[PDB]
Amino acid sequence: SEDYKLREAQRELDKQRKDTEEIRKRLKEIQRLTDERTSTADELIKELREIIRRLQEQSEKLREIIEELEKIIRKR
Amino acid sequence: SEDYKLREAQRELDKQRKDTEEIRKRLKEIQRLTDERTSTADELIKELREIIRRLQEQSEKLREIIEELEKIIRKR
């Protein structure tokens, strides 16, 4: 069954890789705005708080993958 | 051999669990700075930049673990 779970771990890891890269890109965008001085501090803060939330989510996804891999090792 | 490599992977997963907790703690800290609003967007962006780098590193290590478990499970 570990084969099923390992495939799941792989699929999910590929998804967070892709999701995290999108977050990085958004952060680049925010850096651009900051440098351009086109947004208010409040506006910038709002977008940064959203980045933080997205990263917390990605962190949790990795935690779950780790948990599953440990189950695999302990089972197989 | 395999039992050896399984112990290796588990040791690495233990480390990763610790790294995840650190990432989680740092994101909380960064969120708190956002609230104080005693910091610049550049400074906040720098700290988030570092979190992303750390997640990417974690991700690549998990990818490695999965590949080695692939080899074992393939055999099993």
Side-chain angles (χ1 to χ4, degrees):
Chain A
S1 69
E2 297 81 309
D3 192 62
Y4 183 88
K5 285 291 185 172
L6 190 61
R7 293 181 191 279
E8 183 170 326
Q10 180 66 51
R11 292 195 305 273
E12 294 296 314
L13 188 63
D14 288 340
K15 290 179 181 177
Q16 66 79 30
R17 179 177 174 192
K18 184 174 179 180
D19 289 348
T20 298
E21 177 63 9
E22 289 299 310
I23 296 166
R24 187 188 66 80
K25 290 178 186 177
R26 181 64 178 268
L27 186 61
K28 182 181 74 175
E29 182 178 325
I30 294 169
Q31 182 68 80
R32 181 185 61 78
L33 292 174
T34 299
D35 289 346
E36 292 178 353
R37 303 295 194 264
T38 62
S39 295
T40 65
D42 288 340
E43 291 170 347
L44 292 173
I45 291 168
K46 290 178 184 179
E47 286 189 329
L48 292 172
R49 286 175 171 153
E50 184 61 7
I51 293 296
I52 292 168
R53 185 187 64 74
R54 292 173 71 187
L55 291 174
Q56 290 172 314
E57 182 177 357
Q58 293 299 312
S59 183
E60 292 181 26
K61 290 180 180 180
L62 290 172
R63 184 181 66 205
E64 292 183 358
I65 293 168
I66 292 168
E67 184 70 18
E68 293 299 305
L69 293 175
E70 289 180 308
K71 290 176 184 175
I72 292 168
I73 291 169
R74 290 178 178 179
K75 183 175 182 179
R76 180 81 72 189
Chain B
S1 67
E2 289 182 345
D3 290 346
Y4 171 85
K5 296 296 281 175
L6 291 170
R7 287 193 296 276
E8 180 183 11
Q10 180 61 53
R11 291 187 190 101
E12 182 65 37
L13 290 173
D14 289 343
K15 180 175 187 287
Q16 293 306 326
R17 288 171 64 178
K18 292 175 186 177
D19 289 343
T20 297
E21 183 63 27
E22 292 183 0
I23 291 168
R24 186 179 187 276
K25 288 180 179 177
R26 285 292 295 140
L27 287 169
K28 287 178 69 179
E29 291 172 9
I30 294 168
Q31 178 63 53
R32 291 199 285 257
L33 288 173
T34 299
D35 294 345
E36 289 181 0
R37 183 169 177 167
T38 62
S39 298
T40 63
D42 282 339
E43 289 172 293
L44 293 172
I45 293 170
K46 181 177 177 178
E47 292 187 40
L48 291 171
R49 184 176 291 115
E50 178 60 11
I51 295 296
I52 291 168
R53 190 190 66 74
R54 292 186 69 181
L55 288 172
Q56 291 176 335
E57 290 181 341
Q58 180 169 62
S59 179
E60 291 301 313
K61 283 293 173 184
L62 293 179
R63 184 174 298 279
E64 290 176 4
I65 292 168
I66 291 168
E67 291 180 10
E68 290 295 323
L69 290 175
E70 176 184 342
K71 293 176 190 175
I72 294 168
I73 290 169
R74 179 185 294 273
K75 292 179 180 181
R76 297 183 182 191

